[PDB]
Amino acid sequence: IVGGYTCGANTVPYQVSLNSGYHFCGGSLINSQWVVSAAHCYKSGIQVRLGEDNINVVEGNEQFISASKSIVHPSYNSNTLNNDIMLIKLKSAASLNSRVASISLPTSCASAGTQCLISGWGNTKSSGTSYPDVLKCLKAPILSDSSCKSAYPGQITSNMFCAGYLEGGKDSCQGDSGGPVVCSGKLQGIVSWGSGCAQKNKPGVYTKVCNYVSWIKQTIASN
Ligand SMILES: CN1CCC(O/N=C/c2ccc(C(=N)N)cc2)CC1
Ligand SMILES: [Ca+2]
Numbered sequence: 001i002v003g004g005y006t007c008g009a010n011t012v013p014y015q016v017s018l019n020s021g022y023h024f025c026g027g028s029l030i031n032s033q034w035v036v037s038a039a040h041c042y043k044s045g046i047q048v049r050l051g052e053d054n055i056n057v058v059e060g061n062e063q064f065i066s067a068s069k070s071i072v073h074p075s076y077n078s079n080t081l082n083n084d085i086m087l088i089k090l091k092s093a094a095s096l097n098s099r100v101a102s103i104s105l106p107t108s109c110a111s112a113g114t115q116c117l118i119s120g121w122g123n124t125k126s127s128g129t130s131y132p133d134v135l136k137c138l139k140a141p142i143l144s145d146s147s148c149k150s151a152y153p154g155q156i157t158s159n160m161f162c163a164g165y166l167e168g169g170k171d172s173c174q175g176d177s178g179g180p181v182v183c184s185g186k187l188q189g190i191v192s193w194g195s196g197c198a199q200k201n202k203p204g205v206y207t208k209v210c211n212y213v214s215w216i217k218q219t220i221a222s223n
Contacts, residue, residue, distance in 0.1 A: 020046060089223060140164045
């Protein structure tokens with residue numbers, strides 16, 4: 001997260017770190033045994049880390065649970081990033097409390113102008129590289145589809161939206177991938193892609209979660 005703020009320990013209780021020996025992606029806990037992330041975060045040997053603040057220090061509220069299976073969206077295209085969504089099932093159910101909690105799925109899509117909270121342990125620099133150890137947060141508005149498409153001609157599908165600031169300086173970044181965009185207590189987006197980070201006229205592009213609620217629910221119901 002570039003141009004954001006320190007969230008505070010366990011203030012974003014649905015935020016997960018995906019770990020394969022090191023943090024590589026964020027995710028969102030949607031019930032005691034399922035996490036939603038980006039399909040571009042797919043890999044084998046994922047351990048899900050809940051209750052994290054400093055990802056480099058055991059602080060007392062962590063739950064580390066290995067993934068038993070991952071399900072990439074049936075229509076995920078790695079070249080266009082269309083349908084950039086994946087479900088991850090935990091080997092055992094997480095213990096839910098105030099610091100480790102699921103986030104609600106949307107029942108309808110959010111509108112341009114809605115403020116959302118975007119979070120993760122990704123790069124904090126728009127030019128260099130600096131990875132924070134503690135969770136970072138950014139409040140950002142959803143942008144109009146017209147401004148999104150103008151920013152990224154020929155690349156924005158109906159399963160994507162932009163959020164952030166066309167002036168630059170405030171954005172998600174590498175390492176935030178797969179993490180949450182939460183608007184009025186609902187998971188509306190997943191950190192998906194962008195041109196660099198926090199660049200002028202290049203806002204973050206997010207997976208449009210409301211389009212996937214039917215698939216998420218049916219998938220969970222049978223797996
Ligand atoms: C496999 N793999 C693809 C490249 C990189 O992922 N990049 C993610 C990303 C997310 C958000 C933004 C942004 N909001 N500007 C920019 C970039 C690392 C993971
Ligand atoms: Ca920790």
